[PDB]
Amino acid sequence: MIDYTAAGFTLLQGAHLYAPEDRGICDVLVANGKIIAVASNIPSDIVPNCTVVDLSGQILCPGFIDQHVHLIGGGGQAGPTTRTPEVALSRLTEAGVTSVVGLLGTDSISRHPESLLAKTRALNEEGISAWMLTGAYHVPSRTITGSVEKDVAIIDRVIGVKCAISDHRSAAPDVYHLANMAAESRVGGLLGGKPGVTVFHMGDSKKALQPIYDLLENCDVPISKLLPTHVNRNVPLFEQALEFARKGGTIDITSSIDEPVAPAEGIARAVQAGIPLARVTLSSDGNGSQIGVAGFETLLETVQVLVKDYDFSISDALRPLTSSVAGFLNLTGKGEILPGNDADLLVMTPELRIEQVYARGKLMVKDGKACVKGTFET
Amino acid sequence: MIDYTAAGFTLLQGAHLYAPEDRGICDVLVANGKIIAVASNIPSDIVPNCTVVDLSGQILCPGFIDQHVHLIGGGGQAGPTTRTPEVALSRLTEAGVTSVVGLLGTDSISRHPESLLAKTRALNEEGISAWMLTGAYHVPSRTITGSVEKDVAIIDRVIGVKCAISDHRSAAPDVYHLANMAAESRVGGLLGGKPGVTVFHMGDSKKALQPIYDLLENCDVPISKLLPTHVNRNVPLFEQALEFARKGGTIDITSSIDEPVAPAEGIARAVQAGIPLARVTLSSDGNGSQIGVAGFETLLETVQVLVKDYDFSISDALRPLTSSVAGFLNLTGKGEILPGNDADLLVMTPELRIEQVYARGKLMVKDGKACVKGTFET
Amino acid sequence: MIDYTAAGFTLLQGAHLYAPEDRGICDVLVANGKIIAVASNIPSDIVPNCTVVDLSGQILCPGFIDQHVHLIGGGGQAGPTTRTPEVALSRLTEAGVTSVVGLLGTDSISRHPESLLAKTRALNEEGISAWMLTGAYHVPSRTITGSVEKDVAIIDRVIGVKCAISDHRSAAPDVYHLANMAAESRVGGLLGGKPGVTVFHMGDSKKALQPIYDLLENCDVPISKLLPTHVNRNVPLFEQALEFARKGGTIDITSSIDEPVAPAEGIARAVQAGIPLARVTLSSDGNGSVAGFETLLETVQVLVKDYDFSISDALRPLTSSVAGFLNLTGKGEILPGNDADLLVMTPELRIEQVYARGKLMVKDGKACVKGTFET
Amino acid sequence: MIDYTAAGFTLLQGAHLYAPEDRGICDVLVANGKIIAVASNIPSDIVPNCTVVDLSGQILCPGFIDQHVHLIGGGGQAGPTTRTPEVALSRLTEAGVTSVVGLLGTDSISRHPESLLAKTRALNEEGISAWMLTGAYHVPSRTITGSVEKDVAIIDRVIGVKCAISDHRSAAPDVYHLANMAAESRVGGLLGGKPGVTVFHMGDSKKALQPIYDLLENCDVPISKLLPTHVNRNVPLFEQALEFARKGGTIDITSSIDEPVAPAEGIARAVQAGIPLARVTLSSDGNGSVAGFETLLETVQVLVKDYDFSISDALRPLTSSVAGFLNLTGKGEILPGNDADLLVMTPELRIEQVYARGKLMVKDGKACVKGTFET
Ligand SMILES: [Zn+2]
Ligand SMILES: [Zn+2]
Ligand SMILES: [Zn+2]
Ligand SMILES: [Zn+2]
Ligand SMILES: [Zn+2]
Ligand SMILES: [Zn+2]
Ligand SMILES: [Zn+2]
Ligand SMILES: [Zn+2]
């Protein structure tokens, strides 16, 4: 008897697959955490020591990518008792999240990029995929190596930089400071093989997107590296974001913001405005302070709403959380079900309720409950 | 015989109380430095080991909050012989001051925030309540931790930052530098649970308030965090301050400046202009250089004048020194006589002359003379 | 009706009081979070709007002071996944802890004093009392302001410095670096009105206390400012510890270390060795890697149960001895003028109620007050 | 037809397998760059789209791990013209090297860790596996982030630190500086999940290993984290090295140093001295001043040919021993779950094929995969 168990062969059979593209009833063969074949009717005996999974009647889609999470905790805006706690593995996984991008916010005094970096690594070690942004609301940026360009270029998990504009919690940055920082992130990413993006937390100032336009007039950073987030927070801002997207920018809608522009509503309007889904993403702002802390249920909720109350197809509904995110951040191997991609998959009921979650080919959630937990989860 | 002396029970009986709100003849019961009951006719035997004080015929009001004092000394503008000496406890208390905010001025070369911080702490230890501002006239700010945001966030006694504008003694700051500094103070205060204000020493430049308006156009710091002081120093400046107050800003009048706009006059005009007292404060600039050094008698003097020559009610007269200050700096437990507030009280004759002063429930002045002195007072 | 509720009058009646000193059946009156009277038979009507609590048949004693807690989390010695989570309020209060001193350990790369300082502040706001030590195992120390001397003098919650010696995770400090760091903490303590102590995490190196002795010969910091902790981790170290205590030093036994010298055992031997309880402390090392806080109370139970200690004495290492060593004014003793940090226990020493600064935190053995984000 | 080519199924059949352990004639199945099965007679049809390679009559073994390579170039000791060029991929793979650890030497003015780090990354992308050491001969170390402890904990490819002792090109380090630096690497290793080793370039000074012994008496870093290299450079040093190994240390023999103690000879004497192979490593010092990589394989040949070693044993110093010392998970042994880093040799030990992470890199003794700018 030959042992082939090292391969971790798993055959996912008979689900209706949304890659997110509708592929109909189709099988998925996994090995070594990778998707190795996608096809209708894969012989259950094509490989030895194969775990076969009957998904008949279920749906199979790619795992969500949540690009805005306060992995080590956030808050602190109303004193020290408001510092939220760190994110626990199970919370992410039960929410359908297989890939995450961690970041800092208002507080960069009691929160440090080194802490964030360690947490990012723990999460990868625990089973999912994680990256981070250097900086925080504060401009000039607080970094690990002393320079934004150096952080993006040399710290493996760093993919870009974060900042805040048009917000009463900003560092009142001027255009030069902003331009320089985005330029450093851009360059650092070429060198490091990273997207080199600049993510802008938007507040409620009436100036809205101005600073971004100013910046573009003062530098050569491509518009495709600039990401405004929390765009649904106020109407006028939302409206400008639409045009920003119309000009070739990508906009990030926050799932945790219900009013004045609800998330599904925001996505629907984009489409109405003729904006291609590829230029719209959805992120949670999870673990930030809400006093409660923002969770991850809003992601799934948005997909359900879009399908059920908005007439989106499941395929379209999935984009903002999968392919558009991977697309924007250049996350190779993620967001789509293709041979050669990582085996980050969700298994859902036809009513869009998660039953199982695979991260890198490993069963993380079964029967809608986490079977793999963070090291200190109790 | 049971000892209940630890409580320090004190009953202040029968004065006409101005909370500053007129409460008429009313009693005040104190314990553990706190006001525990305010009411007419409190039974002199409600608590054991109670010190009863007959205030019949007298007035009872809250202790003054002087938010602009050069606690460690100031001056130095005309050479080293002009460096004034540090403030002595008794000077404050005999002047009716129970709470103070220390700060630096022109000289930040021979004066350091660490010195100011130590002095602040000594004063609390000696019996009164004290806080400070980081920075000084110089922009960029000279701080303790290296950053304005960090100083406000982590040094317990630091509540904001000071600077100078439109003055021949300024560091010729540009809008960005100013904006950044105010933004840091603002943010630092959210984190630290401080007001996070920015206090602007105003000089006689013709530009007057401009820089403040410029700043607001270049940042998202709320107008309510910005405090221009010495507004009565020149007419045109005073006039602009009125409108500044009209737009929602708070203005600080300096009691030690007699011309061209006297303090009581300044306060009267504000009211004439329809500005709510809540938006007007009065501070001494005590211990700065005047060669003499500015004292604290001008505070009380202003209240007397307002009542006697201006027709203000005592209640109204008290605001700028009590509730409006506490209101502006968010000094919980101060500026008002309510159960649960600190027992910082003044006892005056009907002609507004101070007889006794209680700081945190402790008798500091009796018969208009200090009975508790600074450790080195001789 | 006049309202006097701002005073928070509370009368704890009928318990057998251990201050820690046995005081027999005695009453305790509280106002504004402070103990205002201690006597038998205080009248229930002595003050208006008084909450009377009948504790007859129960024991009353001071809240515990745990001077060795990884408040923001610790661990990380076996990689990133081993970083423990921050401590929740209820875990402390349920274990009888009303005062705590937070610190860092091995990891001072992903762990920062500024973070520790915020957490310290959070806890104070939440209802208990907390302080911290600056530095970490690493020497030179990583501080907030850039100087150990400055951190201790100016940061209100900082009371001393932490370091590691004789351990395979130390920074290989030399005597000069150790002396200087201890002297800075000492001096900062004076300027800031802090104890200005130096806390030494002890490892298993054969050199044991050597470095301390060396330090003493190289500086003039008083012996009473130097605290070796984890002294019960190995025999030779423990024995050396006894000697150090005999010379005038204080020693900290770790409740979470059960072998080779158990906590109660170590305490009993110290005493049997002629060392006064005043020079013996007990701390948990709670939240390190996740070590909990139940061993504290258990040590007390064991001392009484198996070692012939009176209750009074068994309490000292967690109350008066710590408060005394750290100069925690208002803590560790039930006296008029002190803070109302009290435990209510059954005669068999099970925690029933806990008051911190006069506020009821735990009732029927269960936290009734929780951390802001406690789930 | 269903496409399964994404898996890269490859079946290596019929070779005499040395894992390094002699396993006789046995098959190896590979998928996704990992070894998924090791057994005799694996069915050629067991998996779809399988590339079958008939290796009958050949030997199969693990790829070599060269832990001492001047990846970006070295030299510069006789002025600017002596700076050697960076290492090309094919030079490594042709020599049987599939895993490498890069480092700096004498020159840390014209040579930077950031440059070394980029080159390390380049190689990983090009198909092999690479790590680096922070620092250089200079002590205090010149690092990327400013701290040895921080470099090791946070820079993914950094696994330890390099330094020079007992050499006329050293920085004249004192024991404190050496101890501190070793302790920082040790601690960073723990936090980052790295071996956290200290690699000591040994020169010809008569003091030989002294500094190491001294260091040990001045810190608590385990002996197993300290690696003296170039130990065969002189006799007295070599002999002292044997002793150090006997005490529990590991020793690195330089394949490029032929006198006075040749590489094979040194290995044979170590063994004859009672030292287990697990505590003996072999590295090239390749690309220094331009030293090549052929002496690696030659040492193996000589051990077998002239020293009575079995093949299994002769392989250890370049495979399992290194992987074990550096904790290189997935490397140095042919086991299910490990990376497909394999060599195909003739029975007389000549390299024929080389696979790195399952990719064919060298064929018929010639690189068939080259560096991006390889000419
Ligand atoms: Zn945000
Ligand atoms: Zn956020
Ligand atoms: Zn001024
Ligand atoms: Zn002034
Ligand atoms: Zn320890
Ligand atoms: Zn500890
Ligand atoms: Zn060398
Ligand atoms: Zn070398």
mmCIF file of C-alpha atoms in Angstrom, chain A residues 22-152:
data_model
loop_
_atom_site.group_PDB
_atom_site.id
_atom_site.type_symbol
_atom_site.label_atom_id
_atom_site.label_comp_id
_atom_site.label_asym_id
_atom_site.label_seq_id
_atom_site.Cartn_x
_atom_site.Cartn_y
_atom_site.Cartn_z
ATOM 1 C CA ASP A 22 -21.127 30.769 -14.503
ATOM 2 C CA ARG A 23 -19.620 27.426 -15.443
ATOM 3 C CA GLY A 24 -22.728 25.388 -14.670
ATOM 4 C CA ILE A 25 -22.413 21.995 -13.055
ATOM 5 C CA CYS A 26 -18.717 21.358 -12.933
ATOM 6 C CA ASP A 27 -16.106 19.531 -10.945
ATOM 7 C CA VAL A 28 -13.038 20.856 -9.153
ATOM 8 C CA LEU A 29 -9.843 18.811 -8.428
ATOM 9 C CA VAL A 30 -7.432 20.103 -5.842
ATOM 10 C CA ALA A 31 -3.911 19.128 -4.857
ATOM 11 C CA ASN A 32 -1.301 20.685 -2.674
ATOM 12 C CA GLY A 33 -3.626 23.597 -1.996
ATOM 13 C CA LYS A 34 -3.883 24.335 -5.692
ATOM 14 C CA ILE A 35 -6.686 23.954 -8.203
ATOM 15 C CA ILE A 36 -5.381 21.489 -10.733
ATOM 16 C CA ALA A 37 -8.381 20.831 -12.940
ATOM 17 C CA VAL A 38 -11.809 22.317 -13.516
ATOM 18 C CA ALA A 39 -14.168 20.249 -15.593
ATOM 19 C CA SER A 40 -17.413 18.502 -15.913
ATOM 20 C CA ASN A 41 -17.269 14.889 -14.841
ATOM 21 C CA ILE A 42 -13.894 14.214 -13.370
ATOM 22 C CA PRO A 43 -13.475 10.503 -12.706
ATOM 23 C CA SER A 44 -13.534 9.996 -8.963
ATOM 24 C CA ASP A 45 -10.569 7.672 -9.352
ATOM 25 C CA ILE A 46 -8.344 9.866 -11.532
ATOM 26 C CA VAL A 47 -5.945 10.219 -8.532
ATOM 27 C CA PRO A 48 -5.098 7.971 -5.575
ATOM 28 C CA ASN A 49 -6.084 8.730 -1.917
ATOM 29 C CA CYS A 50 -8.683 11.187 -3.164
ATOM 30 C CA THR A 51 -11.145 12.746 -0.844
ATOM 31 C CA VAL A 52 -14.431 13.045 -2.774
ATOM 32 C CA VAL A 53 -16.961 15.677 -1.864
ATOM 33 C CA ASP A 54 -20.551 15.571 -3.075
ATOM 34 C CA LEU A 55 -21.672 19.151 -3.674
ATOM 35 C CA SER A 56 -24.666 18.162 -5.617
ATOM 36 C CA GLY A 57 -27.352 20.811 -5.109
ATOM 37 C CA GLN A 58 -24.830 23.356 -3.770
ATOM 38 C CA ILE A 59 -22.945 26.269 -5.206
ATOM 39 C CA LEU A 60 -19.236 26.700 -5.451
ATOM 40 C CA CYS A 61 -17.533 30.065 -5.652
ATOM 41 C CA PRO A 62 -14.265 31.747 -4.909
ATOM 42 C CA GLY A 63 -13.405 32.852 -1.371
ATOM 43 C CA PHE A 64 -13.796 36.543 -0.561
ATOM 44 C CA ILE A 65 -10.955 38.986 -0.454
ATOM 45 C CA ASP A 66 -11.490 41.653 2.266
ATOM 46 C CA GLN A 67 -9.077 44.411 1.591
ATOM 47 C CA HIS A 68 -9.922 46.623 4.593
ATOM 48 C CA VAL A 69 -9.590 45.052 7.968
ATOM 49 C CA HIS A 70 -8.161 46.230 11.265
ATOM 50 C CA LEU A 71 -6.461 42.930 11.969
ATOM 51 C CA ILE A 72 -4.756 43.985 15.293
ATOM 52 C CA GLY A 73 -7.651 46.084 16.479
ATOM 53 C CA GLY A 74 -8.683 49.680 15.865
ATOM 54 C CA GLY A 75 -10.791 52.327 17.535
ATOM 55 C CA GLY A 76 -9.364 54.459 20.298
ATOM 56 C CA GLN A 77 -11.098 57.673 19.005
ATOM 57 C CA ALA A 78 -12.864 58.098 22.301
ATOM 58 C CA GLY A 79 -10.126 57.266 24.662
ATOM 59 C CA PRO A 80 -8.264 54.075 25.458
ATOM 60 C CA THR A 81 -11.283 52.046 26.465
ATOM 61 C CA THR A 82 -12.305 52.258 22.738
ATOM 62 C CA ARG A 83 -9.348 50.301 21.382
ATOM 63 C CA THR A 84 -10.846 47.260 19.785
ATOM 64 C CA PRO A 85 -9.321 43.848 20.134
ATOM 65 C CA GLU A 86 -7.502 41.903 17.461
ATOM 66 C CA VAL A 87 -9.322 39.824 14.798
ATOM 67 C CA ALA A 88 -9.799 36.092 15.396
ATOM 68 C CA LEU A 89 -9.321 33.634 12.597
ATOM 69 C CA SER A 90 -12.762 32.003 12.855
ATOM 70 C CA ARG A 91 -14.520 35.329 12.391
ATOM 71 C CA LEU A 92 -12.966 35.757 9.053
ATOM 72 C CA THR A 93 -13.444 32.241 7.831
ATOM 73 C CA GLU A 94 -17.022 31.828 8.925
ATOM 74 C CA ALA A 95 -17.663 35.038 7.064
ATOM 75 C CA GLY A 96 -16.334 33.565 3.786
ATOM 76 C CA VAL A 97 -13.051 35.567 3.938
ATOM 77 C CA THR A 98 -10.003 33.618 2.697
ATOM 78 C CA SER A 99 -7.773 36.552 1.836
ATOM 79 C CA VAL A 100 -7.323 39.770 3.824
ATOM 80 C CA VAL A 101 -5.465 43.120 3.656
ATOM 81 C CA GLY A 102 -4.743 44.558 7.134
ATOM 82 C CA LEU A 103 -4.311 48.210 7.904
ATOM 83 C CA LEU A 104 -4.149 50.924 10.580
ATOM 84 C CA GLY A 105 -6.495 53.889 11.111
ATOM 85 C CA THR A 106 -6.797 56.887 13.313
ATOM 86 C CA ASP A 107 -4.447 55.635 15.979
ATOM 87 C CA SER A 108 -0.902 55.149 15.030
ATOM 88 C CA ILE A 109 0.384 55.962 18.557
ATOM 89 C CA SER A 110 -0.659 52.842 20.346
ATOM 90 C CA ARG A 111 -0.802 50.825 17.067
ATOM 91 C CA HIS A 112 2.324 50.012 15.143
ATOM 92 C CA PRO A 113 3.023 48.552 11.695
ATOM 93 C CA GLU A 114 5.340 45.962 13.272
ATOM 94 C CA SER A 115 2.453 44.628 15.308
ATOM 95 C CA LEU A 116 0.277 44.556 12.228
ATOM 96 C CA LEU A 117 3.016 42.761 10.341
ATOM 97 C CA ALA A 118 3.330 40.020 12.960
ATOM 98 C CA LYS A 119 -0.452 39.471 12.972
ATOM 99 C CA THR A 120 -0.442 39.277 9.174
ATOM 100 C CA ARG A 121 2.129 36.537 9.325
ATOM 101 C CA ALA A 122 0.274 34.620 12.041
ATOM 102 C CA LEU A 123 -2.820 34.543 9.851
ATOM 103 C CA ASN A 124 -0.925 33.103 6.906
ATOM 104 C CA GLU A 125 0.570 30.523 9.209
ATOM 105 C CA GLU A 126 -2.852 29.727 10.585
ATOM 106 C CA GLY A 127 -4.299 28.965 7.164
ATOM 107 C CA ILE A 128 -5.497 31.989 5.235
ATOM 108 C CA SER A 129 -3.760 34.583 3.051
ATOM 109 C CA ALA A 130 -2.869 38.023 4.399
ATOM 110 C CA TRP A 131 -1.038 41.250 3.373
ATOM 111 C CA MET A 132 -0.965 44.749 4.786
ATOM 112 C CA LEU A 133 -0.586 48.416 4.074
ATOM 113 C CA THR A 134 2.063 50.527 5.729
ATOM 114 C CA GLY A 135 1.223 54.030 7.108
ATOM 115 C CA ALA A 136 -2.133 54.890 8.814
ATOM 116 C CA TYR A 137 -4.238 58.045 8.785
ATOM 117 C CA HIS A 138 -1.164 60.115 9.648
ATOM 118 C CA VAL A 139 0.728 61.866 6.902
ATOM 119 C CA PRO A 140 3.642 61.843 6.779
ATOM 120 C CA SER A 141 3.424 58.072 7.159
ATOM 121 C CA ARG A 142 4.643 56.138 10.136
ATOM 122 C CA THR A 143 6.540 53.201 8.676
ATOM 123 C CA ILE A 144 8.621 50.245 9.530
ATOM 124 C CA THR A 145 11.853 51.016 7.715
ATOM 125 C CA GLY A 146 11.633 54.760 7.826
ATOM 126 C CA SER A 147 10.445 55.180 4.265
ATOM 127 C CA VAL A 148 7.256 54.354 2.399
ATOM 128 C CA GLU A 149 9.224 53.393 -0.727
ATOM 129 C CA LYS A 150 11.504 51.087 1.336
ATOM 130 C CA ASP A 151 8.629 49.516 3.225
ATOM 131 C CA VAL A 152 6.769 48.594 -0.031
#
